[PDB]
Design an enzyme around this catalytic site. Structure first.
Site, PDB file in Angstrom:
ATOM      1  CB  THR A  53      -0.913  -0.076   1.365  1.00 29.44           C
ATOM      2  OG1 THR A  53      -1.621  -1.285   1.175  1.00 29.44           O
ATOM      3  CG2 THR A  53      -1.975   1.282   1.264  1.00 29.44           C
TER       4      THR A  53
ATOM      5  CD  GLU B  32      -6.788  -4.804  -1.741  1.00 33.53           C
ATOM      6  OE1 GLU B  32      -6.085  -4.194  -2.808  1.00 33.53           O
ATOM      7  OE2 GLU B  32      -6.118  -4.676  -0.645  1.00 33.53           O
TER       8      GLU B  32
ATOM      9  CG  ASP C  70      -7.805  -6.937   2.904  1.00 29.92           C
ATOM     10  OD1 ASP C  70      -6.618  -7.546   3.413  1.00 29.92           O
ATOM     11  OD2 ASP C  70      -7.766  -5.984   2.424  1.00 29.92           O
TER      12      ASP C  70
ATOM     13  CB  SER D 171     -10.346  -1.316   3.170  1.00 28.01           C
ATOM     14  OG  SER D 171      -9.120  -0.545   2.834  1.00 28.01           O
ATOM     15  CB  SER D 172      -7.736  -1.036   7.740  1.00 33.18           C
ATOM     16  OG  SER D 172      -8.009  -2.244   8.241  1.00 33.18           O
TER      17      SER D 172
ATOM     18  N   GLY E 223      -2.367  -2.074   6.237  1.00 28.88           N
ATOM     19  CA  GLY E 223      -3.462  -2.799   6.580  1.00 28.88           C
ATOM     20  C   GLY E 223      -3.854  -2.408   7.650  1.00 28.88           C
TER      21      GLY E 223
END
Ligand code: CA
Lengths: 182, 358
Positions: A1, A40, A43, A62-63, A84
């Site tokens: 990320t 993804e 997650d 998501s976070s 994350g």
């Protein structure tokens, strides 16, 4: 990320977190086309039935926490980070340090972070004092004895008193801040 | 540098080459959205492990003309053939993370490129060819990799060795080192195509078919129909107040905004500046607070198109005081279950609370 942020001469303010999940995502590179494909969907929860179960066409939880802080209706500070589930920790600790502790933006970003999502999962950055760490463990926490870097905050402060911007990139990658004067 | 000042604009990114590209867009009279688009392309080339057109993201924009804050949400979606139990084996055991994270079932339909096009439609002032062109050059002609990327290649070499990455990133079986030139001819070709044709090449075209084919090759179910179905969405922020400031952050399908806000609300009443930043007392109270908020996240957070997230209850001041009963310097709290934010909501969850292995 990765998280990045931009401000311009017209008052637009961007705070953008963007990802392929893990580093290199799945690792799959599209043959002939050169791009990495995300992982993804891991997650999602692996055991179904809950809020974040897998479903067709659903988006995995998501976070990511791209943020803009405002004072009297106008933007003053952008914040965001990779990591994350640790993102919540990076962003909130940056905001606490700048506003509650009154640190400079750079000191707020560079202050050692901690993260813990459960009684059996802890992380801390170098600079957490060793004695204090061990005392927290004596009390019941489960910090390890090795540090890890947590997140990577890029931020812009919008200095309306002086009609200027201040950008900061976190030391945890080789990021930079670059101003523009026309 | 790590810190900069500027009168007329500012960029901060994780890669010096991307920061320079975005600053140049601003120097030539583009706006922050134009610059952000150019930066995403640049990071896709120079920081390829972290983001790009094979993923998704959340682009928060404050519009200086309208005074509105909105979010271009390019989060990926599961394909139609995804199934609730796809991460379990036929005996119900969770497939190990390293394995499932490399498999085609992990690949969501990518959104980033459609996100950049939505941002450009709303706010762009420079043509998309101008914004992608600097990254075509970095891809085609190469650049010297930094330490973070060199380290990433080394640490992920096993994963990369199994895919078409290997000839680019592990030439002759050895990771590229810091300072080695990384050339990405195929990625350049892809960016040229997008420059010529736009995202149709990706979502209804040759790139898309190659995505679907390699996803299936690695065991996933994505098809071209999955690709052509995708569109981004635009979200309003979740807002909260802290220390006299209004904070705009990312709503569901992120947990980030609401739980960042919740942590701040839980810790605010402890007036943590009374304790040194490296004190036992600050770290303890942060750790106790995080355990509570992460437990609520595990229970109650998911994609709001599907599931009802109790955003009002999670931040209700009464609920914050309930949780604060469990946050003290007197003792270590081991009662770390989720709370009941639905007491402070009109409805109920439309799902179960399901423990997940750590
Ligand atoms: Ca740090």
């Amino acid at each position: 990320t990765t998280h990045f942020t931009v401000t311009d001469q017209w008052g637009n303010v961007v705070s953008y977190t963007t990802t392929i999940e893990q580093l290199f995502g799945t690792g799959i590179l599209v043959p002939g086309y050169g791009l990495f494909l995300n992982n993804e969907l891991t997650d999602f929860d692996a055991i179904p039935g809950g809020a974040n179960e897998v479903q067709p066409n659903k988006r995995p939880l998501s976070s990511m926490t791209p943020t803009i802080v405002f004072k009297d209706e106008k933007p003053v500070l952008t914040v965001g980070s990779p990591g994350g589930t640790t993102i919540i920790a990076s962003v909130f600790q940056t905001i606490l340090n700048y506003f509650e502790y009154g640190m400079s933006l750079q000191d707020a970003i560079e202050e050692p972070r901690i993260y813990t999502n459960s009684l059996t999962s802890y992380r801390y950055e170098s600079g957490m004092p060793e004695d204090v760490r061990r005392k927290l463990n004596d009390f019941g926490h489960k910090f390890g004895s090795n540090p890890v870097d947590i997140g990577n905050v890029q931020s812009i402060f919008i200095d309306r008193e002086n009609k200027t911007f201040m950008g900061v990139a976190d030391s945890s990658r080789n990021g930079t801040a670059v101003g523009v004067n026309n | 540098d790590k810190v900069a000042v500027g009168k007329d604009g500012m960029v901060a990114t994780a890669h010096p080459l991307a920061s320079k590209i975005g600053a140049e867009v601003l120097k030539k009279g583009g706006n922050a959205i134009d610059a952000a688009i150019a930066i995403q392309y640049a990071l896709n080339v120079t920081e390829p492990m972290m983001s790009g057109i094979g993923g998704g993201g959340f682009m928060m924009v404050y519009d200086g003309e309208t005074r509105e804050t909105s979010i271009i949400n390019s989060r990926e979606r599961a394909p139609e053939g995804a199934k609730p139990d796809m991460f379990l084996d036929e005996d119900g055991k969770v497939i190990p993370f390293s394995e499932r994270s490399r498999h085609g079932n992990a690949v969501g339909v990518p959104g980033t490129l459609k996100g950049l096009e939505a941002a450009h439609k709303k706010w762009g002032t420079k043509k998309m060819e101008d914004l992608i062109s600097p990254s075509i050059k970095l891809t085609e002609e190469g650049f010297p990799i930094d330490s973070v990327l060199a380290d990433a290649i080394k640490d992920h070499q096993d994963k990369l060795s199994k895919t078409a990455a290997k000839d680019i990133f592990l030439p002759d079986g050895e990771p590229l080192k810091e300072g080695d030139i990384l050339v990405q001819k195929d990625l350049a070709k892809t960016f040229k195509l997008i420059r010529k044709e736009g995202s149709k090449a990706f979502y209804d075209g040759e790139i898309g078919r190659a995505i679907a084919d390699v996803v299936q090759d690695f065991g996933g179910s994505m098809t071209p129909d999955d690709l052509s179905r995708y569109e981004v969405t635009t979200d309003k922020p979740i807002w909260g107040e802290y220390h006299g400031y209004d904070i705009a952050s990312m709503p569901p399908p992120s947990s980030g905004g609401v739980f960042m806000l919740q942590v701040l609300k839980l810790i605010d009443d402890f007036h943590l500046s009374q304790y040194d930043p490296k004190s036992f007392e600050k770290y303890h109270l942060l750790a106790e607070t995080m355990h509570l908020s992460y437990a609520d996240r595990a229970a109650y957070a998911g994609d709001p198109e599907f599931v009802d997230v109790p955003l009002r209850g999670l931040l209700d001041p009464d609920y914050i005081k309930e949780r604060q009963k469990l946050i003290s310097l007197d003792s270590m709290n081991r009662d770390v279950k989720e709370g009941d934010p639905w007491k402070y909501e009109e409805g109920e969850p439309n799902y179960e609370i399901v423990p997940q292995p750590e």
